[PDB]
Amino acid sequence: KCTLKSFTVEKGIYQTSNFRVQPTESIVRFPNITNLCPFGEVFNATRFASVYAWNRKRISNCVADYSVLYNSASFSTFKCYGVSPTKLNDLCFTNVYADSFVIRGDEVRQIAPGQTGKIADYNYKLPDDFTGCVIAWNSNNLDSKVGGNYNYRYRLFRKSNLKPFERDISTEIYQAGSKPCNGVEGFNCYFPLQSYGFQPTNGVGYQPYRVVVLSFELLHAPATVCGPKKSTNLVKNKCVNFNFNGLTGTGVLTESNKKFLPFQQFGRDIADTTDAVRDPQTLEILDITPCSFGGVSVITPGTNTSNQVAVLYQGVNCTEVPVAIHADQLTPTWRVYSTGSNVFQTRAGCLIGAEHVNNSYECDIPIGAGICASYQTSQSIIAYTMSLGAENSVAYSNNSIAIPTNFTISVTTEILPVSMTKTSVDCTMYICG
Amino acid sequence: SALGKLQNVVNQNAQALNTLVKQLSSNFGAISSVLNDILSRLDKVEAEVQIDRLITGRLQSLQTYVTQQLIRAAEIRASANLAATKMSECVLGQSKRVDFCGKGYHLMSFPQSAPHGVVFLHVTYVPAQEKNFTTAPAICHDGKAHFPR
Amino acid sequence: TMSLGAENSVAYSNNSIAIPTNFTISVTTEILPVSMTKTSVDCTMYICGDSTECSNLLLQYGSFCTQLNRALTGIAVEQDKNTQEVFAQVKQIYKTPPIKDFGGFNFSQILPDPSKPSKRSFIEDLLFNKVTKFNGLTVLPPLLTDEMIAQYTSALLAGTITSGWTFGAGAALQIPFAMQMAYRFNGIGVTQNVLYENQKLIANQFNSAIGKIQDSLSSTASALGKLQNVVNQNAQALNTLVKQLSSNFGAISSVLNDILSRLDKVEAEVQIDRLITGRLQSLQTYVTQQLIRAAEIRASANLAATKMSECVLGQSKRVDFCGKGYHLMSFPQSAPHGVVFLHVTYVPAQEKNFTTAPAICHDGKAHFPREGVFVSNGTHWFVTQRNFYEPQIITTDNTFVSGNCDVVIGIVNNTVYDP
Amino acid sequence: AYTNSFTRGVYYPDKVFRSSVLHSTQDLFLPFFSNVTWFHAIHDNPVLPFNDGVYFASTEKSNIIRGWIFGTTLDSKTQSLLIVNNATNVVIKVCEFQFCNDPFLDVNCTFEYVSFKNLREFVFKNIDGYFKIYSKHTPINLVRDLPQGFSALEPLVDLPIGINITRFQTLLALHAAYYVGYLQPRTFLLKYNENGTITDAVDCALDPLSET
Ligand SMILES: *[C@@H]1O[C@H](CO)[C@@H](O[C@@H]2O[C@H](CO)[C@@H](O)[C@H](O)[C@H]2NC(C)=O)[C@H](O)[C@H]1NC(C)=O
Ligand SMILES: *[C@@H]1O[C@H](CO)[C@@H](O[C@@H]2O[C@H](CO)[C@@H](O)[C@H](O)[C@H]2NC(C)=O)[C@H](O)[C@H]1NC(C)=O
Ligand SMILES: *[C@@H]1O[C@H](CO)[C@@H](O[C@@H]2O[C@H](CO)[C@@H](O)[C@H](O)[C@H]2NC(C)=O)[C@H](O)[C@H]1NC(C)=O
Ligand SMILES: *[C@@H]1O[C@H](CO)[C@@H](O[C@@H]2O[C@H](CO)[C@@H](O)[C@H](O)[C@H]2NC(C)=O)[C@H](O)[C@H]1NC(C)=O
Ligand SMILES: *[C@@H]1O[C@H](CO)[C@@H](O[C@@H]2O[C@H](CO)[C@@H](O)[C@H](O)[C@H]2NC(C)=O)[C@H](O)[C@H]1NC(C)=O
Ligand SMILES: *[C@@H]1O[C@H](CO)[C@@H](O)[C@H](O)[C@H]1NC(C)=O
Ligand SMILES: *[C@@H]1O[C@H](CO)[C@@H](O)[C@H](O)[C@H]1NC(C)=O
Ligand SMILES: *[C@@H]1O[C@H](CO)[C@@H](O)[C@H](O)[C@H]1NC(C)=O
Ligand SMILES: *[C@@H]1O[C@H](CO)[C@@H](O)[C@H](O)[C@H]1NC(C)=O
Ligand SMILES: *[C@@H]1O[C@H](CO)[C@@H](O)[C@H](O)[C@H]1NC(C)=O
Ligand SMILES: *[C@@H]1O[C@H](CO)[C@@H](O)[C@H](O)[C@H]1NC(C)=O
Ligand SMILES: *[C@@H]1O[C@H](CO)[C@@H](O)[C@H](O)[C@H]1NC(C)=O
Ligand SMILES: *[C@@H]1O[C@H](CO)[C@@H](O)[C@H](O)[C@H]1NC(C)=O
Ligand SMILES: *[C@@H]1O[C@H](CO)[C@@H](O)[C@H](O)[C@H]1NC(C)=O
Ligand SMILES: *[C@@H]1O[C@H](CO)[C@@H](O)[C@H](O)[C@H]1NC(C)=O
Ligand SMILES: *[C@@H]1O[C@H](CO)[C@@H](O)[C@H](O)[C@H]1NC(C)=O
Ligand SMILES: *[C@@H]1O[C@H](CO)[C@@H](O)[C@H](O)[C@H]1NC(C)=O
Description:
By secondary structure, chain A is mostly beta strands.
C-alpha cells in the first residue's frame, strides 16, 4: 500500500522493498600499537626553522591524539583540507609528515593549497590537492629578538618557482640585472635571501608566527599512525557493522580462500568497493562479504477479495532468510514470514505464506521459472507449476484422413490503440511561472 | 477488462501528467519547493544560487517526460500502422494471411470506433464435426493413374 | 572496390521462353531475437547502498527513483509477453505418434530426443551450444523455462507433421504426410502428380538438406550473431552501469564511505550530492537505452510471431517472406533469447529454351491455354504447366477460345485436337 | 652495445588483490621491445644517469654483482643511496662518502636499514621522495641476452629517503654481465588471474593492434 501510494491493491505481484540481513554488532580492528606520537617535539621545538630551509619530520609506528592539539586554545588557526578535524581520532594513516618553520604574520595567508605570494612561489609550496591541516600561531613573544633577527629568511626570484614539498638550500646570487653577476653585487646583482626584522614592537602583520603543517599519507599500505580508538574481538559468518583501520561499512565477515600476495592488504570489486581485508591484529585474510539481499515481491489476490498475502524473497534460499519478526529491521517483518508452516524453494527465490500444490493449472499470478500462484480453497494462496495446455495424440496413420462435416461462423473482437492525448507544455511556465 | 489496451493508454498518459505535476513539490537541494519562498526570504545574489537548483531539477524532470512520450508515441505509431493495415487487408478485402484477421479462415471484418483506438469484428469460418475416412493419393483404372482435380 | 555480383544478359526476345525441367528442395535457416534478459535495479541501493545519510538527500529528488523502477518493470514484464506471443500459438500440446512413417521424410533431427536431460531435438541442442553485481542490480528468470519452450516447439512441430494447416484454423485433422506435401506443391502452382511421381527423390533432397544444417551449425556459429548480440549488448550495458560506480563526478572520492568517514555533515552533503547527481544520470542513461533496445526486440518478437502464424501454421504466398524460392513449409526450433525457422522451399533448377506463342489459330478461332503456356521443340507444339516441363498435346480440354485470329499479336497456326 | 627488452620489466602497480579481471593503469614502465645497454665485469662500469627510473638486470655464474650507489653525483658532498648484499644481509644506507669508490667492494648518513646461468632483474623508481624496489630471480638457458617471454617482478622495499636522484653506478665484490634500461609513462592493460597475480600485460601505446 505504501509502495503503490494506494489503500486498495489489485491482484498481482509487487516489488515493494529490498530485504537485507542486518548488522548484529559493530566490529573494530586496528594495529597493535600504544606508544604515543612525538607531538610535543613537533609543536614545542625551542626554535622553529627558517622558512627558506624549513623542517620536515616523518611520524610513524605510534598512537596520536589530535584532541590535545585541536582543543588547545594555543593556536591562531587550525585549517584543514579533505578532512574535518573532528574525524582525526577515528581515521588513520600509513604515515603523517609534520613540516615546520617561523613566518611573518601577513604571509600565513600564503600557507594553503593553490595560494599565491612570494613564499608560496619560491620557498614553501603546498600541492593544489593537499590532504591535511595547517596550524599556525603568533610567536612575537618568542621569535622577535629585539629587532635584527634576520636569521628568518625567504625568497623572491633567483631563477624559477618552487614545486610542492621541494626542499632547497642553494646560495647562487640573484641575477635580476642583465650582467653575469659571478658572485659579485651591483645594480640588480644581489644576495639570494630576503630576511625579516622581527621587533617585538612590530605591527601584527609584520610579527613572527610559528607554523606546523600536517600532511596525511592515506595510501593503500598498512596503517602506522592511528587515533585513541579501541578494537573489539573479531566476528565471523554473521552480518555486522565494521571498521578496519578507518575503512567502515556493513558485511558478513568470513575466512577467505583468496590467495592474497604477501604485500596485498585489501581486495576490490569492479565497482571500486572493498570485498576483502587482512586483519591488522590476526594477520588472517577475510572477506567483507556483502550481507545477503533480495527484492521483496509481495503476492496478493485483490484486497477486493482477501487481505491474506504471500512473499517471494527473490534469489535468497529458504535456508538463509533470517527475518521471522520485527526484531530484524523493518520490511515484511510480521511475525511468521520466514519460518511458517508452508515455505517453498522456487528457483526464483524463497516463497513464504503460499501453499505448494502437486496439480497444474493455467497461470494466474506469474512468479517465475514455470511457477504461478492463485487464491483457492479455507482459502489460501496456492503455488504450482503452470499448465501449457491439454495433451493430444493426433490419430495419424499413412492412409487415414479426417474431414469436417459442418462449420461454425465465429465473430472475434480485436482491439487496437491508434492515437493518444495531444499534450502541450509551456516550459517557462512549468519551470518558472 | 476486455478494453484493457485502450484503458491502459488513458492510464499511462494520466500517470505521466500526474508524475510531472508532483515533481513541482521536490526541493532538488534548494531551501524550498516554492519559488516565491526563495524570492521573498533571500536577496538577489543569494537567491539565484537556490533558484538554479530548481531550474536544474525541473528541466531534468521535464526532459524525462518528453523522452518518455517520444518513446511511447513510437509504440502507438507501430499500432496505428497495424490498424491501418488491418483496415486495408481485412475490411476493404479478404485476407489469405493466417491468423491476421482472427482465428479460422477469414470471411470478412467490420470496424467499430472506440476511445483512442479501433475495434475489428473479424468474421471467420471455423470447421466442425470431423469424421474419419480411408484415403489414397491416386486411383488405378485401365492401368492409368487418376488424381483428383 | 566491392563487386555487386556477376553481370548477366538475360536472353530476351519477343518469342523465346525458358521452362525449368527439374527442381531442388532447399531448407534454409532464419534466426530471430524474441526476448532479452529481464533485469531490475533497486535504485536506492545502486545510488546510495546502505547509507541513511545519502538516502535522505536522495529524497530531495522526489519520484525520479520510483519512475526508473517502473520503467524497468515494464521492460521486464514484456519479455515474457514477447515469448508468449511467439510460442504459445498452439492451444494443445500435440504429440507425435509412436511410429515415424511419414512417407520417406525423416524429421528425427528436429523432433524431441528423450535421451536429452531436457527433451530438445538434436538441432535445438546444437543451437543451445553455439550461443554463450551486488549493487542493487539483479537478473530475473523468464516465466517459461527452456523445457517449456521446447514443449511448445515440439507441439507446433508434431501438429505440423500430422495435420498441416488445419491445427491453426480449427481442431487438428490427421492427413498422410505425402498427401500434405502434394497439396503444398499444388499451392506453388506445380501439379500434384509431380510429387507422387518423384516422392523418393523429393524425400532424399529434404533429408540431405536437413543433414547439411547440422554441419553448418557445427562449423559456422557466426550465423547465431543475431542472438549472440542480445547477450553481448546486455552484458556490456550492465558492465558499463557497474563501472560507473568508480567515477568521481567531481567529488573527493568514488567511495561513499570515504566521504562519510573523513567529513562532517555540512561538508559531506556537498560531496554526496555530486555522487547522487552523477549516479542518477548514469542510471537514467542505462534505463533510456534499455527502453529503446526493448522496442527493437519487440519489433523482432512481432515479426517472429507473424512467421510462426503465416509460415509454420500455414503456407505463404508472400515473396521472400519465408526463404527464397516458392515456400512449401517451415519448422520452428528454439534457441537462447530467440527462435529459428527452417524454411523449406522449391527452387526450379534446370532451364531449357523454347519457342513460344501467346495464342493459336485453329479453324480461324484463336485458342488460349487454360493453365500453362504454349511451347515448341521446333517441329511440334505443346502446352506445359509454367514451373516444370510436362509437355501435353493441345486439345479443347486444356485450351479456351476467344474471337478470330486477327486481333492477337504473335498468334501462330497449329491444329487443336478434339477428343 | 645493445640488446632488446622484449616483454620484460612488468611489476605490480598497487597493494590490492583483484581476481580474474583485465585492469588498466598508467605508470612508469619499460616499453615493450625497446632496447637496453649491455656491460660485463672488466675494467663497462662508469656512472650512468637514472632518468625517471631504472630497469636493471644481470646474468651471473654465482652472483658476482653485490650492490649499487644512486644519487645526484656520488661525490662525498651530498647524501647518496647505497644498496649492498654483504653475504649475511641486504644493507642499505644514504652516506655522501666514497668509502669504496670503484664499482666493487674491496674484500652524516641520515638513514640506514638492514634485513651466467642465473638471471636477476630489478626495478628502481622515485615518487615524491619515496624510492621503490622490485625484483625477480631465476636460472635461464639463454647465454647473455634478456629472455623473450613474460614474467612479473614483485616489490621488495620502499625507502622514504627524499633524495633528488639523477645518477647511479653498480657494485661487484672482489679480492658476470648486466644490462640497463629506463622506465617511461605508459598505459598498460593487466591480466589478474584467480590468484591475485598479474599473468600478462599489453603496452597500449606500442602499435595499432595494442591500441585496439
Ligand atoms: C633537484 O635538482 C634540481 C636541479 O637538478 C633543483 O632545481 C632547481 O630548483 C629551484 C627551486 O628550488 C629553481 O629555482 C631552479 O631554477 C632549479 N634549477 C634548475 C637547473 O632547474 C631542485 O631544487 C632539486 N630538488 C631538491 C628537493 O633537491
Ligand atoms: C533432377 O535432379 C536430380 C539431382 O538434384 C537428379 O537426381 C540424380 O540422378 C542421378 C542419375 O542421373 C543419380 O545418380 C543421383 O543419385 C540423383 N540424385 C539424387 C539427390 O537422388 C535427377 O536425375 C534430375 N532429373 C532430371 C530429369 O534432370
Ligand atoms: C532417420 O535419419 C537418421 C540419421 O539422421 C538415421 O539414423 C541411423 O539410425 C540407425 C538405426 O535406425 C543407426 O544404425 C545408424 O547408426 C543411425 N545413423 C546415424 C548417423 O546416427 C535413421 O535410421 C533414419 N530413420 C529412418 C526410419 O529411416
Ligand atoms: C518434338 O516432339 C515430337 C513429339 O514428342 C518428336 O517426334 C517424335 O520423335 C520420336 C523419336 O524421337 C518418334 O518415335 C515419334 O514417332 C515422333 N512423334 C511424332 C508425332 O512425330 C520430335 O522428334 C521433336 N522434335 C525435335 C526437333 O526435338
Ligand atoms: C495461318 O493460316 C492462314 C490460312 O489458313 C493464313 O491466311 C492466308 O494467308 C495468305 C498469305 O498472306 C493469304 O493469301 C490468304 O488469303 C489467307 N487466308 C485466309 C483464310 O486468311 C495465315 O497467313 C497464316 N498465318 C501464319 C502466321 O502463317
Ligand atoms: C606544548 O607545551 C604546552 C605547555 O607549554 C603543553 O600544554 C602542550 O601539551 C604541548 N604540546 C603538545 C602537542 O603536547
Ligand atoms: C596483537 O595483540 C594481541 C593482544 O592484544 C595478541 O594476542 C596478538 O598475538 C597480536 N598480533 C600480532 C600480529 O602482533
Ligand atoms: C470486488 O468487489 C465487488 C463489490 O465491491 C464485487 O462485486 C466483485 O465480485 C469483487 N471482485 C472480486 C474479483 O472479488
Ligand atoms: C539452499 O541451501 C542449502 C544449504 O543450506 C543447499 O543444500 C540447497 O541446495 C540450496 N538450494 C538451492 C536452490 O540452491
Ligand atoms: C507431491 O508429490 C511428491 C512426489 O513428487 C510426493 O512425495 C508428495 O507426497 C505429494 N504430496 C501430495 C500432498 O500429494
Ligand atoms: C479416427 O479413428 C481412430 C481409429 O483408431 C481413432 O483413434 C480416432 O479417435 C478417430 N477420430 C475421430 C475424429 O473420430
Ligand atoms: C538459351 O538460348 C540463347 C540463344 O542465344 C543462349 O544464349 C542461352 O545461353 C540459352 N540458355 C540455355 C539455358 O540453354
Ligand atoms: C519479333 O522480332 C522480329 C525482329 O527481331 C520481328 O520480325 C517479329 O515480327 C517479332 N515478332 C512478332 C510477334 O511480331
Ligand atoms: C636497438 O639498437 C639498434 C642499434 O644497435 C638500433 O638500430 C635499433 O633501432 C634499436 N631498437 C630499438 C627498438 O630500440
Ligand atoms: C650532512 O650533509 C649535507 C650535504 O648533503 C651537509 O649540508 C650537512 O651540513 C652535513 N651535516 C653535517 C653535520 O656536517
Ligand atoms: C653485513 O652488515 C652487517 C651490518 O650492516 C654486519 O653485522 C655483518 O657482519 C656484515 N657481514 C659481513 C660478512 O661483512
Ligand atoms: C591458484 O591457487 C590454488 C590454491 O589457492 C591452486 O590450487 C591453483 O593451482 C592456483 N592456480 C594458479 C594458476 O596459480
